[PDB]
Write a protein that binds this DNA or RNA. Structure first.
Ligand SMILES: [Ca+2]
Ligand SMILES: [Ca+2]
Ligand SMILES: [Ca+2]
Ligand SMILES: [Ca+2]
Lengths: 152, 153
DNA sequence: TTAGGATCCTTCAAAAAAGGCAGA
DNA sequence: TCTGCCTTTTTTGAAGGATCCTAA
């Protein structure tokens, strides 16, 4: 649990509200208890020419990594505990993505509980729906309703 | 007077501008201006129109400028020279990606009065416009300092 | 089984220009 | 002439997913 400087968080919140994404996904997979897994991602995208900015972000946040897809690169943070700490500190300063951040926090806090109960897993999937609705979602496939086929 | 902007607003806004903003300098052909071209300087923030309220708030906070809709997106735009200069002066220290463009815009604005008085000074200021376009992800630019250099006629 | 990572696609939502008009 | 508003176009640079892999 790093603590960040306020001036860094203020600037970063603005940058994330611009070029960032707070992403929650339900991924079908037969080896998981409820035939699906939850994936939570904080991402910041930038033309690879400016990957240096993302590399600096790695250093400054102190966790995560940068992946180059050719034309653009992405800073990525997915590991649950660091993501929780980071978003806890970022969230107060967000204006466009605040609600997404807080839903990701609520999801993370319920994960242990969602592992034990299909009712509970479903409910957490509905919060994933809400995050997608808050985002500019356009290619989504798997939703809580797909899962609700734990009806069975 | 020049509006004084608050620190936490400038810090957040600097991040947001490095994200979705644009600092733009243009040379616009126009036969009714002294050297057949007008310099135009713009600070712009783009956002999908469902989030226009965020751009509308910028008009309130910055206290000048306007919002325009186009297709599915809207833009906050500030091009009025004196307020733009005051705003970018205060924003520039917190910029990380667009700091150089901000500082070039400030330099150009400072030189406008004497740009309007010699071909060679006008040309030089135009090369500063070239430098901003280079720093930006320029892709549709037409009129450059070389276009101007047709003051040669 | 579970979590994190790898690799890629889909579709814009931005960016960064290009222009034009009409009053003072 | 000037300047400050207006209005469109072009081409991405982002966003926001999708899905396979494998060590733990
Ligand atoms: Ca954005
Ligand atoms: Ca939406
Ligand atoms: Ca950007
Ligand atoms: Ca460039």
């Amino acid at each position: 649990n790093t603590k960040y400087n306020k001036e860094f968080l203020l600037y970063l919140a603005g940058f994330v509200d611009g070029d960032g994404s707070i992403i929650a996904q339900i991924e079908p997979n037969q080896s998981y208890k409820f035939k699906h897994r939850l994936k939570l991602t904080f991402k910041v995208t930038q033309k690879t020419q400016r990957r240096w900015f993302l590399d600096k972000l790695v250093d400054e946040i102190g966790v995560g990594y940068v992946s180059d897809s050719g034309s653009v690169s992405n800073y990525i943070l997915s590991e649950i505990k660091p993501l929780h700490n980071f978003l806890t500190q970022l969230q107060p300063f967000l204006k466009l993505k605040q609600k997404q951040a807080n839903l990701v926090l609520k999801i993370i806090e319920q994960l242990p509980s969602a592992k034990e109960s299909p009712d509970k897993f479903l409910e957490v999937c509905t919060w994933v729906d809400q995050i997608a609705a808050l985002n500019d979602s356009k290619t989504r496939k798997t939703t809580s309703e797909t899962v609700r086929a734990v009806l069975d």
